[PDB]
Amino acid sequence: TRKTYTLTDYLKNTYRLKLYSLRWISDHEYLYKQENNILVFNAEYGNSSVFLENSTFDEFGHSINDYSISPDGQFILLEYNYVKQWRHSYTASYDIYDLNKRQLITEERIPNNTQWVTWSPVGHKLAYVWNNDIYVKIEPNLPSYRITWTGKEDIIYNGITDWVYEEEVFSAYSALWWSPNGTFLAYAQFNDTEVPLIEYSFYSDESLQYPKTVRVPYPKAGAVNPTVKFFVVNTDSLSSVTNATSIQITAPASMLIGDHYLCDVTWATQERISLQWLRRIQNYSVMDICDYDESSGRWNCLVARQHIEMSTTGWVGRFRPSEPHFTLDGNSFYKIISNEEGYRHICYFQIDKKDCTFITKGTWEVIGIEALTSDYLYYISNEYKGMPGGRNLYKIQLSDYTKVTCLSCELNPERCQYYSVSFSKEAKYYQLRCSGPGLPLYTLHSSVNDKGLRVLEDNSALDKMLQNVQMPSKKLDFIILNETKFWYQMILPPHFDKSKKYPLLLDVYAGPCSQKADTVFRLNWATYLASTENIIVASFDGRGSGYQGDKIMHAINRRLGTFEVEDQIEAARQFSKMGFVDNKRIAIWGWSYGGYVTSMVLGSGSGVFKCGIAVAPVSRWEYYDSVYTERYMGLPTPEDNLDHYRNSTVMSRAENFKQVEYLLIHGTADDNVHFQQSAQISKALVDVGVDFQAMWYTDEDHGIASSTAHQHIYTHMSHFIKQCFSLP
Amino acid sequence: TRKTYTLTDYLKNTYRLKLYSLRWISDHEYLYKQENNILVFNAEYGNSSVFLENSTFDEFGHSINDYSISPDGQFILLEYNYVKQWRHSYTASYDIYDLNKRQLITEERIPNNTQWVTWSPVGHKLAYVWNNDIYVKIEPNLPSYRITWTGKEDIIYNGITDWVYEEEVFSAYSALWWSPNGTFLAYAQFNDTEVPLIEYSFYSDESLQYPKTVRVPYPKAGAVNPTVKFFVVNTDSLSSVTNATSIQITAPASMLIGDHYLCDVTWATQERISLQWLRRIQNYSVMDICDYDESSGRWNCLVARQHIEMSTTGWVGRFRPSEPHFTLDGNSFYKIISNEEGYRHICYFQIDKKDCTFITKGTWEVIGIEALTSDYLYYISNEYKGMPGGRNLYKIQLSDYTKVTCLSCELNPERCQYYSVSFSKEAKYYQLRCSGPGLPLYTLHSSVNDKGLRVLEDNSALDKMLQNVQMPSKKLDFIILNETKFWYQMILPPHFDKSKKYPLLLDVYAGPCSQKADTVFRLNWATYLASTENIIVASFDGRGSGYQGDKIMHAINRRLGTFEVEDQIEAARQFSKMGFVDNKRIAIWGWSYGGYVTSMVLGSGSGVFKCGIAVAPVSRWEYYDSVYTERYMGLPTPEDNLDHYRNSTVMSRAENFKQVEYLLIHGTADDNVHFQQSAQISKALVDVGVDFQAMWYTDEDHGIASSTAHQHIYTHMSHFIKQCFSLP
Ligand SMILES: *[C@@H]1O[C@H](CO)[C@@H](O[C@@H]2O[C@H](CO)[C@@H](O)[C@H](O)[C@H]2NC(C)=O)[C@H](O)[C@H]1NC(C)=O
Ligand SMILES: *[C@@H]1O[C@H](CO)[C@@H](O[C@@H]2O[C@H](CO)[C@@H](O)[C@H](O)[C@H]2NC(C)=O)[C@H](O)[C@H]1NC(C)=O
Ligand SMILES: *[C@@H]1O[C@H](CO)[C@@H](O[C@@H]2O[C@H](CO)[C@@H](O)[C@H](O)[C@H]2NC(C)=O)[C@H](O)[C@H]1NC(C)=O
Ligand SMILES: *[C@@H]1O[C@H](CO)[C@@H](O[C@@H]2O[C@H](CO)[C@@H](O)[C@H](O)[C@H]2NC(C)=O)[C@H](O)[C@H]1NC(C)=O
Ligand SMILES: *[C@@H]1O[C@H](CO)[C@@H](O[C@@H]2O[C@H](CO)[C@@H](O)[C@H](O)[C@H]2NC(C)=O)[C@H](O)[C@H]1NC(C)=O
Ligand SMILES: *[C@@H]1O[C@H](CO)[C@@H](O[C@@H]2O[C@H](CO)[C@@H](O)[C@H](O)[C@H]2NC(C)=O)[C@H](O)[C@H]1NC(C)=O
Ligand SMILES: *[C@@H]1O[C@H](CO)[C@@H](O[C@H]2O[C@H](CO)[C@@H](O)[C@H](O)[C@H]2NC(C)=O)[C@H](O)[C@H]1NC(C)=O
Ligand SMILES: *[C@@H]1O[C@H](CO)[C@@H](O[C@H]2O[C@H](CO)[C@@H](O)[C@H](O)[C@H]2NC(C)=O)[C@H](O)[C@H]1NC(C)=O
Ligand SMILES: *[C@H]1O[C@H](CO)[C@@H](O[C@@H]2O[C@H](CO)[C@@H](O)[C@H](O)[C@H]2NC(C)=O)[C@H](O)[C@H]1NC(C)=O
Ligand SMILES: N[C@@H](CC(=O)N1CCCNC(=O)C1CC(F)(F)F)Cc1cc(F)c(F)cc1F
Ligand SMILES: N[C@@H](CC(=O)N1CCCNC(=O)C1CC(F)(F)F)Cc1cc(F)c(F)cc1F
Ligand SMILES: *[C@@H]1O[C@H](CO)[C@@H](O)[C@H](O)[C@H]1NC(C)=O
Ligand SMILES: *[C@@H]1O[C@H](CO)[C@@H](O)[C@H](O)[C@H]1NC(C)=O
Ligand SMILES: *[C@@H]1O[C@H](CO)[C@@H](O)[C@H](O)[C@H]1NC(C)=O
Ligand SMILES: *[C@@H]1O[C@H](CO)[C@@H](O)[C@H](O)[C@H]1NC(C)=O
Ligand SMILES: *[C@@H]1O[C@H](CO)[C@@H](O)[C@H](O)[C@H]1NC(C)=O
Ligand SMILES: *[C@@H]1O[C@H](CO)[C@@H](O)[C@H](O)[C@H]1NC(C)=O
Ligand code: NA
């Protein structure tokens, strides 16, 4: 009898999934790390060489957290002293190593505690943010040029984002953009002067006698948001003037009438930049295309080149307006937008014409535009087999839209239905990354003829190990509700037997544009629960889920805490009606948005669930951040949508928690979903006399990802689940 | 067959203990509130008259929290708008009603948010504190005089204590002391300028969008402490034209050499005041005796009248140097101090004489001095039957110390072994309050011949109700350890059968000078645990406990977390060896200091305990307040006692928790034992991979006493204990 996939296996990573992370440094060479050694590979022949021996920094006196080679290969940026902050932000120290002279630079070093640094796209110019101010170095060993003087901790951010812009808008800490050949440096400036502060205690190491109070500007729903400004400085003039001028590009009149956001920055050419602005009521965005005026050194955006993008049924974009992809001459661009049927497709735009032309269509959607050459546009979509949970790479002929080739569909249809792609500098080569439903597979391909060059990593090692293990199986299918298909997936125990009644755990996220039913292969907690505990773990994408058209995604518009909650309850009913589910043992759990939904479900009084676990849940929308909350709920005022804000809290369903077993967990240093949210749930439960289980994690954030806490929380949830299901 | 004392009975107070709280207003009469009516009683005969009708304030508007009748019976201070702060502090609104003219006063009324107010001991003058400043009103309807102007929130405290002085020194918010006839008003002034602040979150009602941050000047061990000054002001010579003049009495030189505290203020006569000062290293105190000089108007404290009290084995006094009891003329006084054998007895002092004379002696202790006349001194001790957990009222003839008469011992030996007393003004009458082992019994007596006048309240109603309940019994006995006897108590289930094995729960506090083994009758959680769950609840008084001499109490000096912890493990070990205890089911629980001991026991690796519960425990002494911690631990510096501060923590024992079941509870708004303490405990367990149970209580402080929380915590603990014991 083969062993099963146990909890320890999951927590200890005994069965390691291999990947192949490469970095294109040109149109046909990439870097790969093998044995702490940085090797350079020739894509065409697969032959390589040592780019940087591991023994190169033995006597550095510091552990190098990451590296970055300048575009011209002349220098390398060494990052150490990594200090994590939020999801993407962190501070670190940096040193530059001169590859040709093989000497480490020791003059005019990058300051310690630098918030962000990036090479220019070409050459070896450097731009970094320190103490909230931007600096540029034309040469690694020369003095820096200061670009801004207004930077102020927690107040003015130049070149970097504030908490909400980092988390909800740019998904990055940096807020600066080098133009294509590096002449100009554009950046955003955020002013959080009047933004309220979230405050919580951080206890730190046992040696700290007095707890520290963390204070970060964070706008909750309906609160004062940060204002923003955009500028562009010409770095080429830095060595000719004492103080180079940052030219401001003001937002359009349609945005200045009220609160708004800068939501996208994309350079089109060396002298044309595009910007998208979004109104605080996120259903109206504007794109300005601005050209450099050489005579006045100013930037002008002709209204004839201004493009409007709005929505009548919801917000704009899946999570925000999509990014434009310009043709070489910068006179036209491709952008994904939802069509008249509500499906997201690629529209072709002339920069000075408002009507665009869709180049793809159908009851499926384009996930993203991956590359654009003078002849072809490549993109990933879920068109194949009508599976919204699948992903494939396509190629469309620019001179004939009826010519579309699927570059990955048939490569290995039984093992690979979820693809990701990585193109070389000029798209001459591309690495395909298959992540499911079989073992991940990485392959390298040639664009000139779309031929497979070779297999980079097939995970044979793991496949070998997984042979002596009773692995669970995965079922991806759908059920029909109101003439509409709704997908679900099930992690089934080994030797599944449909004649038996298995306990069921509904794994839920269910946030707007989410997708929990897909063809991806994962080794996670559900693997253990299904393999060792013979527990069926299920997920369901109901109303509000993504990649299936706006009719489904925008169904929860201004109504969070309703349909996506009910549909989840309905999904459980349908499952127990499949005959292999023990209706007496049905649980539900989720994290983040999932915790909210789990809590809302447990408080519905449906009688369908026996117990449930919520990890770091939202409890009332007024406690979450403005950008994300208002996108779906509008403003919490009586003139807008306050009644629903008050009607969709977890606390108001406290009395119904008497019918179930609840486990509430939250990290105390959670800067995203504040502990406050679970503190209010627990108080509501205590207030109506409801018993439940709770667990706080000291100094842990939204991810509760520290190694020990990660193991502690899943171990704790396992006991609770096993107990609720009466499992030995 | 009949009902048992259930958890609901404990939580809903089904069985209420009746009391008889009277207030002496002279040497012959007292006030007693009955049916919301205030009656005046004649002690000699028991006849009464209505002093103030309950309906007198029907249309008052506000709900009266409490009342206070001026010493001359002319006025009544009405308290409303009560808002609790710490253990003793609070603010409220006050109104003064004229009893003579049966009219409420509307002119020059006491401000709102008043921090403290008190009548003068004689007549009807008033002294109140508002915005940290002292005010005085000679007549209820006249404008008040500002005494201090330095009052500054969280910085300068005039007439009221800061956090630590309130909690650890005076056990009161008040820092005002009227001279006997009200001529003088002495007060202390606290300066917390450099005292670090403890900060934590307060969430409030769910309507509060942003959590509030509470900040309180709180000196942890080793931190900067507040400084203090003492003043005396003549209130008979106040002017509305000139600012009042305060005369400062500085501390003795032996104190000014370093950090110190003002630990006691006691007026001797109309013109003589005594103050005791304590060095930061709490084993050396000094009493100054100051006389008013009618010539200069200054207060002079003759060095010849200075009295030093020190300890070579520990700190001075039980929790602080005891209070002196002066004779009528104020030339001599009585005070409890430990004798050469280490037992606390009454010493008689001459104000200008260095050697005092002990008037009581023996291997037992005087608890407190209760009354003094020219012929007798009345006191309470635990001498009777050599039971350190019993209390009785005695009187000793001042002209012949060999004549000691016990006044309560034989009143009702089977029902009453624990007395408390309340004398009238000149000690002409006294009320005896028996609180165990039987039901509380209140009686009135006459001092002239120690006659028992009458029974005020015998709780015969409760007695009748308890007859239909299967109530548990209490066993008080001792065990021997190294020639020394240590007492313990066991709450035994109904129909106790020593031939059966009962699970056992150790109820522990064990702080320095604590006593958890006594003859007091209580209806609490343990009553329910024994009566309904058939669990034995034991408590043990080991090394470090009080009322048994310094050899036992000072055993833990400079070494907390050692002997008192080891002694509990020994008691349990010994109880486990008794025939009626199931050694496979032994548990331990505690709150505050008891939470610390419980945690230290569970992390000892003794193997005696299966599970335990810790509520708001101290986890490392550097986190607790200075005045209390340093009293027993000295300073946490390497030249003093830092090493023991570092190895007396719970965190260091984390690894040993693997073999027990632990439930850790704590209120998030705990201003006493900061949540930080449990937060560091949880983080430590997480770090070594130990699973445990937790529960935080949103916005609850150290007593987790709000109605809903109190029911919730005990419900949750009851479930945990029953599950640990396999009890249905
Ligand atoms: C990968 O292999 C190719 C071809 O084998 C290498 O090309 C070299 O091209 C230069 C041209 O100046 C010749 O002098 C070398 O002799 C060629 N090498 C060989 C082996 O023929 C290329 O350098 C290799 N790249 C890497 C990264 O190893
Ligand atoms: C950031 O925004 C704040 C306003 O929220 C600006 O501060 C104001 O500046 C004006 C002009 O200097 C003053 O008259 C006001 O007193 C300021 N108001 C406040 C609330 O501080 C600030 O100048 C902006 N900073 C930048 C760099 O744009
Ligand atoms: C470089 O130029 C900028 C922009 O003119 C200067 O910033 C101004 O600084 C003055 C005071 O030093 C302020 O009154 C202005 O409000 C600032 N404007 C901006 C946009 O920040 C900056 O000080 C200059 N640096 C040097 C060294 O001259
Ligand atoms: C990058 O693009 C910029 C902008 O077009 C180039 O700068 C211009 O260079 C031309 C020379 O053909 C001059 O006429 C202009 O004065 C420059 N404009 C500005 C704003 O500086 C720049 O030469 C390009 N860089 C490289 C390396 O080719
Ligand atoms: C309270 O005691 C004070 C102090 O002994 C009394 O005030 C003194 O009274 C005498 C007699 O009239 C005066 O000659 C002194 O000048 C007063 N001394 C001071 C410091 O004021 C006061 O009379 C007593 N109060 C009552 C109500 O008896
Ligand atoms: C009061 O306690 C202190 C501290 O225990 C005693 O002072 C000295 O403290 C240091 C550091 O712990 C020791 O090395 C000394 O042995 C202690 N004694 C002396 C004389 O230095 C102090 O003695 C105690 N005071 C009394 C009256 O017992
Ligand atoms: C208790 O009873 C006595 C009666 O013996 C009351 O009488 C005393 O006081 C009265 C006024 O307060 C007078 O009218 C009596 O003359 C006086 N008698 C004696 C012997 O002192 C006394 O007041 C009563 N006390 C109360 C509180 O009701
Ligand atoms: C309260 O105590 C403070 C601190 O001991 C006194 O001020 C002193 O400390 C300040 C801050 O550390 C210094 O800035 C001052 O120079 C120092 N002395 C003075 C006179 O301020 C402060 O005066 C005290 N206040 C009262 C009313 O006693
Ligand atoms: C303390 O506050 C109370 C309530 O605010 C004051 O009482 C009055 O309350 C009414 C409304 O209830 C207000 O309009 C008045 O301004 C308040 N003052 C008066 C004189 O009516 C109360 O007066 C305050 N205490 C003091 C000493 O002023
Ligand atoms: N804050 C939101 C960010 C977000 O949704 N993305 C970044 C912006 C674009 N979109 C994405 O795909 C994600 C990824 C993911 F979070 F997974 F949705 C996530 C988020 C939602 C929520 F309801 C919580 F209570 C907590 C939380 F962290
Ligand atoms: N802070 C201490 C106050 C104290 O002990 N008293 C006030 C001063 C004089 N003494 C007493 O008798 C008490 C009564 C009691 F607290 F019950 F001991 C109590 C205390 C001790 C401890 F270890 C904690 F973690 C929390 C706590 F609240
Ligand atoms: C490079 O260093 C790593 C780690 O020290 C080691 O595994 C590897 O053997 C080294 N490179 C080679 C070619 O051995
Ligand atoms: C960065 O910090 C280190 C450690 O303090 C210091 O030695 C070094 O000089 C610093 N480098 C710079 C550029 O400030
Ligand atoms: C944008 O959303 C608001 C809120 O529902 C709505 O009133 C307004 O008409 C919308 N604009 C468009 C173009 O739909
Ligand atoms: C005073 O009011 C209480 C209730 O508040 C009531 O029980 C009592 O009867 C009243 N007093 C009298 C003398 O009736
Ligand atoms: C009393 O002292 C205060 C505090 O300095 C001052 O402001 C006030 O004017 C003084 N009043 C008189 C009458 O001197
Ligand atoms: C006496 O008993 C105590 C505990 O009460 C123990 O610690 C000690 O070692 C024993 N012996 C002596 C000499 O104190
Ligand atoms: Na009698």
For residue B587, how many other CB atoms are within 10 A of its CB? 25
**Amino acid sitting at position A599:** S
Q: Is the torsion defined by CA of A574, A578, A583, A589 positive or negative?
A: negative
Calculate how close chain A gets to B688, using CA atoms only, in Å.
8
Residue A718's SS3 state is helix
> Inter-chain contact A698–B686, Cβ cutoff 8 Å?
yes
Residue B167's SS3 state is helix
Concatenated DSSP letters of A519-556: S----SHHHHHHHTS--EEEEE--TT-SSS-HHHHGGG
What is the rounded distance in angstroms from the CA atom of residue A64 to the CA atom of residue A46? 28
B70 a catalytic residue: no
> Inter-chain contact B668–A679, Cβ cutoff 8 Å?
yes
- Paired sense of beta strands B299-301 and B307-310, if any: unpaired
What is the rounded distance in angstroms from the CA atom of residue B392 to the CA atom of residue B410? 10
B156 within ligand 8 shell (Cβ under 6 A)? yes
- Paired sense of beta strands B3-4 and B469-470, if any: parallel
Q: In this structure, what token pair is assigned to residue A654?
A: 């406290």
Nearest-CA residue for atom 9 of ligand 10: A319
A203 to chain B, any CB pair closer than 8 A? The answer is yes
Q: Indicate which residue of B670, B671, B678, B682 is catalytic.
A: B670
Q: Is the torsion defined by CA of A80, A85, A88, A89 positive or negative?
A: negative
> Inter-chain contact B711–A689, Cβ cutoff 8 Å?
yes
Nearest-CA residue for atom 14 of ligand 14: A312
B514 a catalytic residue: no
What is the rounded distance in angstroms from the CA atom of residue B289 to the CA atom of residue B283? 20
* Cβ–Cβ < 8 Å for A594, A601: no
Which of A301-325 are b and which e, b meaning 16 or more Cβ less than 10 Å from the residue's Cβ?
Answer: beeebbbebebeebbbbbbbbbbbb
Comparing CA positions, the residue from A234, A232, A199 lying closest to residue A214 is: A199
Report the chain B residue with the minimal C-alpha distance to residue A666. Answer: B696
> Inter-chain contact A712–B698, Cβ cutoff 8 Å?
no
B58 within ligand 15 shell (Cβ under 6 A)? no
What is the rounded distance in angstroms from the CA atom of residue A278 to the CA atom of residue A261? 5
For residue A198, give the nearest of B210, B220, B649 by CB distance: B210
Element (H, E) at B49: strand B48-52
| Touching B: A residues 637-666, CB under 8 Å | 649, 651
- Distance set, CA A543 to CA A142, A607, B198 (Å): 57, 22, 47
Could you tell me the strand order of the sheet in which B366-372 lies? B366-372, B376-381, B392-397, B404-406
Experimental method of this PDB entry: X-ray
Q: In this structure, what token pair is assigned to residue A130?
A: 């320190």
B675 to chain A, any CB pair closer than 8 A? The answer is yes
A466 to chain B, any CB pair closer than 8 A? The answer is no
**Amino acid sitting at position B306:** Q
- Distance set, CA B169 to CA A514, B166, B263, B287, B626 (Å): 59, 6, 6, 16, 11
Cβ-Cβ pairs closer than 8 A, A with B, add up to 120
Peptide bond into A472 cis (omega under 30): no
Q: Indicate which residue of A539, A592, A599, A682 is catalytic.
A: A592
Neighboring chain A residues of B210 at a CB cutoff of 8 Å:
196-199, 220
B668 to chain A, any CB pair closer than 8 A? The answer is yes
> Which residue from A26, A42, A453 has its CB within 8 A of the most atoms of ligand 1, so it is best to mutate?
A42
Element (H, E) at A631: helix A626-633
**Domains of chain A and CATH, by start:** 1-13+468-728 (3.40.50.1820), 17-459 (2.140.10.30)
> Which residue from A149, A193, A224 has its CB within 8 A of the most atoms of ligand 2, so it is best to mutate?
A193
Concatenated DSSP letters of B474-533: EEEEEEEETTEEEEEEEEEPTT--TTS-EEEEEE----TT----SS----SHHHHHHHTT
Nearest-CA residue for atom 17 of ligand 5: B294
Looking at chain B, the residues that come just before a C–N gap of over 2.5 A are none
Residue found under tokens 């500007």 = A217
Quote the Cα angle for A93-A94-A100, to 5°: 165
Could you tell me the strand order of the sheet in which A29-34 lies? A22-24, A29-34, A37-42, A48-52
Which of B368-381 are b and which e, b meaning 16 or more Cβ less than 10 Å from the residue's Cβ?
Answer: bbbbbbeebbbbbb
B36 within ligand 15 shell (Cβ under 6 A)? yes
A105 to chain B, any CB pair closer than 8 A? The answer is no
Which of B203-224 are b and which e, b meaning 16 or more Cβ less than 10 Å from the residue's Cβ?
Answer: bbebeebbbeeeebbbbbbbbe
A698 to chain B, any CB pair closer than 8 A? The answer is yes
Q: In this structure, what token pair is assigned to residue A342?
A: 């509500």
* Cβ–Cβ < 8 Å for A348, A331: no
Q: Residue A194 C-alpha to ligand 3 middle, in angstroms?
A: 22
What is the rounded distance in angstroms from the CA atom of residue B188 to the CA atom of residue B172? 13
For residue B154, how many other CB atoms are within 10 A of its CB? 15
